[PDB]
Amino acid sequence: SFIDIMVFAIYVAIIIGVGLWVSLPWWAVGASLIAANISAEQFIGMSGSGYSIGLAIASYEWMSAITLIIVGKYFLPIFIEKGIYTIPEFVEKRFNKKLKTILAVFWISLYIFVNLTSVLYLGGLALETILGIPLMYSILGLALFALVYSIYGGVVWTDVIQVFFLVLGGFMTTYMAVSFIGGTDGWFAGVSKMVDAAPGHFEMILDQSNPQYMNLPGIAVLIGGLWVANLYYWGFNQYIIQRTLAAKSVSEAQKGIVFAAFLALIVPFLVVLPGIAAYVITSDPQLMASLGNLPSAANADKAYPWLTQFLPVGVKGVVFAALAAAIVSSLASMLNSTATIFTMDIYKEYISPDSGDHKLVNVGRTAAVVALIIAALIAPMLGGIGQCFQYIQEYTGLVSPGILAVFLLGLFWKKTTSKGAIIGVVASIPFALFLKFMPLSMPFMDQMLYTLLFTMVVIAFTSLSTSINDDDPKGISVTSSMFVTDRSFNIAAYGIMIVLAVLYTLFWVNADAEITLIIFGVMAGVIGTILLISYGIK
């Protein structure tokens, strides 16, 4: 690994170099939105699920497509019409600073204990499985790195470069794995061979018999808790959805949303697939003996970093470099968000009402360090959790359904009051907890749907019995010509729905048609990334 460390250092220096040396069309809005899902923690996490469950986990992304249509057509026009740039701003304009403060405490907790803890672990597993450094040291190394971008770190070209090497890295890793499965029959045999070896890894809707049903409960993927997961993700937290939109015409950006929805169908063929390939190889004793740090059920996320080691000499350095840079960039981004929420919504609001921006930034840097040391002390415990994506899923859900109910009712239910919103969001936590800690043997996704419903009922009754007036004064009232979308968006919307129908039916209907789906899907993602970067250069 002489050229390997030499190549790595060149990429790592270029990435740091481009940083120091430093309107929107529909296709840029699309690429920009989907890019968030093309991340190191996503390759590692989604492969872990691809290894443990398989393709059934493409449901998060595939259902994001239909979520994006809804978000674009309904959620967004209200944000533009009522002149909103951030979510906390929407909380303040529809409800109150008290609710905003309650939600801030939930979000900080989520970033520290769920989000950051995960990235440190998923990145820390990658360096361990590639470099050889133990986890405790490996996580700390990334933490010491993120701290540098934090205190002294204080951004577009680096993202375009980063996405490119993660995409290419993913593709190369798949081609290497699948050709190794095919042997002397080429890559084509391997795709067909992996679908023959693990048909259960290409199954979209899970049976109760399946041990993984507890994670993805069958049809609830089309009609249940996954809607809680996606609407919270795309519909509200996405500050980027409003942000990348106030970057042209609404009509144009809706074209972007629908484009991001189409690109959401391709992403699992890049991030999930390596994990399935890893499973197929791992489970073959002839293929294992051929080779001479393995993904296991308890260490599913070792799948993608395990395959990348098998990579050729120049190629290994670059792919590894991109992942490490991506993990660090993801940590810095998360650390900033946690710090801004604390400084703005907690510090400035309560501790020192008029600090001034200069003080606030220094306060934020202190907040980032604290959050990092806390997340860094927790992250080693996430070691045998199996699938980290499921951990990210389950514990965001302790708070995604409550917060999603306040948001959906604020957006649509004119009657919703702050008193209701606060009463329900608070009640949402003991309820959600009751469902996990109670011996009910209920899938978390199932719990999430119940938590949402419970909150909606609580906020609805509370607001009905407390709101003196009919519509809350802060109640959003715009409607009808607000939701109009052009025929281009609509034909694209119908297309994505018709594709999703086929995607969930293809294996059942024709198991031999799945080979075309794995190939065309993976191919569209590569061609799609290279072409979109090329027009971005123009």
UniProtKB/Swiss-Prot annotation:
It is a multi-pass membrane protein. It comes from the Bacteria. GO terms for molecular function: D-glucose:sodium symporter activity. Pfam families: SSF. It is found in: Cell membrane. Gene3D superfamilies: Sodium/glucose cotransporter. The chain crosses the membrane at residues 2-22, 23-38, 52-72, 102-122, 129-149, 163-183, 216-236, 257-277, 310-330, 366-386, 392-412, 420-440, 448-468, 488-508. The keyword Membrane applies. GO terms for cellular component: plasma membrane. Its main location: membrane. Keywords: Cell membrane, Ion transport, Membrane, Sodium, Sodium transport, Sugar transport, Symport, Transmembrane, Transmembrane helix, Transport. Coiled coil: none annotated. Belongs to the sodium:solute symporter (SSF) (TC 2.A.21) family. Actively transports glucose into cells by Na(+) cotransport. This is Sodium/glucose cotransporter. It comes from Vibrio parahaemolyticus.
